[PDB]
Amino acid sequence: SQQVDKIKASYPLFLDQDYKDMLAKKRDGFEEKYPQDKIDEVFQWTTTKEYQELNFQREALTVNPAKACQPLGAVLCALGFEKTMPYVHGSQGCVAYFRSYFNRHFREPVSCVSDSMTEDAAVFGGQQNMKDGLQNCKATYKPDMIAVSTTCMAEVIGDDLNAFINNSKKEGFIPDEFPVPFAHTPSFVGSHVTGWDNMFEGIARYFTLKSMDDKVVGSNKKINIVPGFETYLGNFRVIKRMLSEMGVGYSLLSDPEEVLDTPADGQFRMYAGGTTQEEMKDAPNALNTVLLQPWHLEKTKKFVEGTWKHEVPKLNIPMGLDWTDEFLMKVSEISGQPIPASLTKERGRLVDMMTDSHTWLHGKRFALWGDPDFVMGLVKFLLELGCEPVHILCHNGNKRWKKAVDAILAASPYGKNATVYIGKDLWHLRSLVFTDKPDFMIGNSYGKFIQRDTLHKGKEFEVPLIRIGFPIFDRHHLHRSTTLGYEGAMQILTTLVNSILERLDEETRGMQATDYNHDLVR
Amino acid sequence: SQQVDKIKASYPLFLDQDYKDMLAKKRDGFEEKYPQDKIDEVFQWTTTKEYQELNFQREALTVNPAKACQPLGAVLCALGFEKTMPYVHGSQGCVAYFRSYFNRHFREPVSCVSDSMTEDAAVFGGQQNMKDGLQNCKATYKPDMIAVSTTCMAEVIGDDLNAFINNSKKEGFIPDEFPVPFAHTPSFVGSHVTGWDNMFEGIARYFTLKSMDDKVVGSNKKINIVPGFETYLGNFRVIKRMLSEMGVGYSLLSDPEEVLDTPADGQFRMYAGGTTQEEMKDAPNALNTVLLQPWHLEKTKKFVEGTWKHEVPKLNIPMGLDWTDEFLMKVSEISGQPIPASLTKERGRLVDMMTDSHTWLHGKRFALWGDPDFVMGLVKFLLELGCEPVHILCHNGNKRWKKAVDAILAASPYGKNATVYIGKDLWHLRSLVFTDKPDFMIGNSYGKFIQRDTLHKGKEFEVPLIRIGFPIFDRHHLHRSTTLGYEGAMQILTTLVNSILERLDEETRGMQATDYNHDLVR
Amino acid sequence: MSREEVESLIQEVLEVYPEKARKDRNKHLAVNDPAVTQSKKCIISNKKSQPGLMTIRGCAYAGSKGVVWGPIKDMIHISHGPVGCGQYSRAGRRNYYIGTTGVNAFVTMNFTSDFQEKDIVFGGDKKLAKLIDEVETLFPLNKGISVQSECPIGLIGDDIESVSKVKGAELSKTIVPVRCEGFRGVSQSLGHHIANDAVRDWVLGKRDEDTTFASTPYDVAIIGDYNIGGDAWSSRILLEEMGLRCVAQWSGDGSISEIELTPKVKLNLVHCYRSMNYISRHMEEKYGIPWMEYNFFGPTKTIESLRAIAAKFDESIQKKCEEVIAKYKPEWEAVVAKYRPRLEGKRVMLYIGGLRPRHVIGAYEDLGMEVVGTGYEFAHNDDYDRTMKEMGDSTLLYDDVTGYEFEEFVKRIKPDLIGSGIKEKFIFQKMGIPFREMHSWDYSGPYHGFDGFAIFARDMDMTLNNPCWKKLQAPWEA
Amino acid sequence: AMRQCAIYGKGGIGKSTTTQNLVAALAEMGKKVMIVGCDPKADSTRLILHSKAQNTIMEMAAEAGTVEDLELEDVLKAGYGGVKCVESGGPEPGVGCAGRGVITAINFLEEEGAYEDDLDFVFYDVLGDVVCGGFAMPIRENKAQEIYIVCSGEMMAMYAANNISKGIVKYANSGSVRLGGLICNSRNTDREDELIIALANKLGTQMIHFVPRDNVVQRAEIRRMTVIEYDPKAKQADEYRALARKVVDNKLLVIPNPITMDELEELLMEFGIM
């Protein structure tokens, strides 16, 4: 039943008695489910050290991974170029998922195209799909460029992208001078960040490899900024702001901040802003090139040093206090520009907040996961705040990265109880938060299910989730936040201290029980 | 007892069995407290409509007020002027309170001085205290100006501030030309905002009244902006940013953003930035004056129109979509500058967020309180979002303001169930959230005690508090936020929706109970 | 170091004051010396603050309603006068209690008459009478009412005692009028005195003729402990562990009935001498109840106090006292073994109200730290007499220090840590000096007794050795 | 035009009565006047309104909620000779704070623009015991420019006159207020005229006029009116007409020169005996 004045959606609704009785009849009569005693028994078992040991011996099964496949990254990279239509050569099912995945995180339109390779294209090759595909796309959506990536079906069968595109032009499906950069982005190699790296390097080559002759390093007096896989519009924004504030000429290669945040004014803009082709072609002329997330820009770096002859600085992601400092000192040295009073004040304000909140943050334990660079940037900042990262997981991390993180951890007294894990998933993390409980965990939305499991064991065992990362689907507009620079550090610090105070408030709200500590001032 | 490896502060600590036993014996042996049955009975009683009627019949007793006294506002206003030292003529107990009240909200240093009038000064008057006080302050803290306000004591005995200051100068305690503006700020009249208004008008009169002869309206081609009592740093910044983005010449009169946000760099700065003396003396030459919060800048308006001859626009505080638009269009008409593409895009992005989050905000009932202008702005924005403000409380509001709020409520279908209360306190609001439950309440930290009470009745009766307003003592760095302009609207919107989503996640976290609706994607 | 350099520092600082203030302030700054038993030859205290020098002092109202009366759980305290005093002091002091706020306990609430212009011009005694009736209706479980006078009430001469007596008799309730008008006295101190007198005059004698209370040879009363963060509770568990029975705690988690039962105890244990000596001295001359000061800050002081207290009773209590000390020995020893090495040799400067400036020194020394400077907001000279023995030689002493003075002293002395109030906290943090709130314990657990010593040590270390103190200066600025 | 004056002096010395009679004379001369009563007892306008006014600012404000909800029309009334009358008002003796009420009342008149453009005079009639700042409200900056102290040859009245002169100095030195003179409201003491004249000279002012004690004032008072209205031909009526002119043409405005208690005793002994 429903009262027209107070309509109930599924949640309140199915708690009504009649629905409850019905769900009970369904269970006992036809589901043949295990006794509740048995379920509680197995649940308890899944929270023990014994289970954890078995869990960590997995060799073939992956549960709740914390990573996606390459093409997802390729698509985000492409969207960062002016009037560019991401194009994924392979099966359509792929594109449907890439688009809805990004739709749910940015809550914005995401334009991507597929050449729909079906059964016979798999068997006979997909050269026709490419020919008709490139022509339909160009005619229908009028892009200025089409960045081609691949689905795994097309990688297994070795569809030759270069060849297919060349013939597409040669036979007149698309003008010979229409830009069609490409990249092999296999699902079974690396992760989404790898695809970003491969797609970028593919676009950089297409506009730079064959025209190095007239290039002179430092002739345009700019600095190139390669952002890498980034899902916080604020990160692009703060970096632009900081350089402009330093009066440093720069060129951000792959800038999707405009397409992912177009205005709702009664008009749908499929394309917005983006890195211009001219900017890519003139890139070799910059003084140097800075990689914001080095740990997944390995291929791009090799190309940038080998072909552009740029001396890419060894910088860590500008996150936290020290690394943002190093990043600014490096830009200042490369561009010749001094660090302005504006930025020095901003840094002083970050330090002020750190001192104002240090007593609530000290000794707090955190479990966390995400991409390599991000995760490492967080660990560093947490340490600087006097916090204890205890479980650091990166599903798509590697041995070298791990070693580097273990180095950062040993350099601080606060890293004593921290363990880094690579190749592990969220079902592994789940065991860790049960057997060696941290105060909070920082990660994406998939972590919400871990918080649900911990609370089931008891309120005292519940590990709250602080949302920072990708993807974030159950909160709105957090993708507008910032994690880079002093601004991002101020935002992250605010989120951590207030999460701690929120939980404290929840725990001391019991009247005549725990409320003696429900202070008005904290 | 304590385990050196895991030391417990009061909250966990007093839950240990020995402490529970002890407190139990203390209660039963000597506290002669009412039985638990009686306590629960009276508690329940305080939640009914019968109690609510008795509650609203109060004529002499105020319980848990939502306002402060005049001098608090006069101090904040004085801090907005360059190298100015707030000076409060009267008792020192006051100043100790104004400082710590602000220290706790801004978590910054707050400089304010008192002339410590004691028993014999209340009897013989406080002229000596003024002479020695002004001399001591000037010599010790070397301010470039001393803004004088009053404590209730000096107001009751009618200490003549003007005559004391003039004699202090005539007798050599301070130089004749040293700026000593002043204002009578009665703790028994109006509220803190009235103090801000009086202090400001007193400062404008001191630098302008006697020198209007050479002034010409519009000659300096700027627009004066009077913020009024404001405790969000982001509000001062967003206003400067929007005007500069319009290439509009402006003069912010009373700008404390710098003294309330100095950097922690090893040096203490008593004074920083602030509205200069030259800016105030030149103010009459502006094209016009805009008052950001008209409902508590009444006296200022009268002075600015009568003496400066500026045609102060009838504008509401720039909060929400419509009022920010109106603000911009007016500023554009006064300055001749067109509204830039920049701001047009920002407006479109807010509209985007509203459309992306409207289904979660629709129909949500809110109880809210605060200062006149702020509260009205929130009401207006809430309505544009499709929300239902049900209990609107403004303790320091008046009949006219209430009439204006009712007009804004009647102009919207969403204001059908809203009621505006003036002269009511948080104990009145407590009754309203029991008898006519809202989903959430929006207010300062004082509302935490209300959330505490509601939960005690039961989880299904809990009304979560959403911290927006002044003062906020139990969360960190929220004073850096923004509530004005599109930017402010974006922050408020993100906070409301995610608060809603947070509570939804909390209610559906129960495994095999309510978790069927614990969706990953919201 | 060397009083020679300290005295010079004091003179240098005073150079900025106009003659009048200079001469006055000079009498409130001194270089400690262990032998002087009479501090009036070294420093003067409890005098008016010089106008316009930005002192940290509060008013008599804060002293009455804020520290003495407001703590009492089951009584309703009315801030009589303009809204304001009451709003600023609402839940600002962490005097912890156990109760159901709004029904049987009201500590955290702000009741006020919210005086408007007509209340000042036409008097508010009728408003006070009506206010009392409304309180009785909406809060039937209250066990008594107090009316704390704010400035205006003292000037216009409202007859609050008359209203208190009349309404008191009509409703059969204890209504305590307190004349704590802000402008009376020179600090929070006179408010303590006025408060104590009101207790004596309107509450303490209630059961003088009653003998239904069953007393024992071991009944004690803890007076002068406001249970900041639970300080009183962690003190109470120790006293009861050695066999004593605490019949009352004065104003921390205190109830009106335990106040009324205080005249039946065998010994009054006073923690805060400054605020409660008045009533302690009255109960001795009237009831013959002796009183003794104690100190539960740090193990050396706590153990010294448990033994001195135990000595006032028989052997069974003294035996239990040693048993209590043996129990906690491993615990506090573990605290020092871990935190002393991190804190050893660090120097601290303090500035507080009227007790802690002297009382917390031992705990600091228990962690190997040294108190290089101390001072009080509103202490009397009997407080300073007790201070010279606790401080080391050639250490700095300041009474009612000004903002300028404190800042300048810190710049030269360069202490490793500062312990003061919320009005000083953010100044020194900007200067890059670790700071710890010594009033509100910076919202941290209790510091009294053995359990508090561990939290005390963890807090001092957490703040002093935090990494942020190294980042104050931007790398690109030598 | 537009002159604001404040009347001060010993308790019950006759200032409210003299003012009203002086004002009735002024209106007879065709001058426009307003009288502002600054005494809890709202009795500074009875002889002009022919009744004890009840619409006092403070009481009216207490009813309307706040002074901010009040309006000139409700408290400002015109009486004999077209004279405008307003009363500060206050509490009954022994409670409240009448000083604050005056501060509030004066500001309300100021903000409501009562001090209209075509008034010739405004007289603040202040009580005899100026026991606080509130009662000095009339002589703060931009208010009364001239003060008249009413007294008599009585020792205690002259002491109150000198005492008040001391209080005026703070305000006169910080502003433009000046003592216009002493009005002797005779009480039949010995050598009364010499006494007041000597004190005036010592203070550095002048004895503006000498009003004789005449029971006709009381008979007129009983009938709720001034002597000028009650009996125009009365000899006393002409005394007020002469006081009015002395006031209108007065140009002597100085800063009181307070004397010590000893100087005052010495003055009484010299001009007081015989």
Ligand SMILES: Nc1ncnc2c1ncn2[C@@H]1O[C@H](COP(=O)(O)OP(=O)(O)O)[C@@H](O)[C@H]1O
């Ligand atoms: N010139 C006069 N002759 C006779 N009686 C006078 C004269 N002036 C005043 N009085 C009397 O003195 C009484 C009190 O004077 P009042 O006007 O109230 O002065 P104040 O304002 O100083 O109290 C009046 O009732 C009146 O009878």
Ligand code: CFM
């Ligand atoms: S500043 Fe205690 S004499 Fe009083 S509130 Fe603090 S050093 Fe007070 S110990 Fe106490 S619980 Fe105190 S910390 Fe005496 S009660 S007027 Mo501000």
Ligand code: CLF
């Ligand atoms: S059509 Fe459908 S969704 Fe596409 S792949 Fe094929 S079954 Fe799967 Fe899988 S890993 Fe990523 S999403 Fe593709 S590229 Fe391969």
Ligand code: CLF
């Ligand atoms: S010294 Fe102390 S705190 Fe000051 S007033 Fe007096 S009792 Fe109270 Fe009250 S309302 Fe505001 S804060 Fe003052 S001006 Fe009056």
Ligand code: SF4
């Ligand atoms: S002497 Fe004046 S300020 Fe004092 S209470 Fe009385 S009327 Fe009020």
Ligand code: ALF
């Ligand atoms: F008694 Al009065 F003026 F009426 F002094």
Ligand SMILES: [Ca+2]
């Ligand atoms: Ca969108």
Ligand SMILES: [Ca+2]
């Ligand atoms: Ca700060």
Ligand SMILES: [Mg+2]
């Ligand atoms: Mg009179």
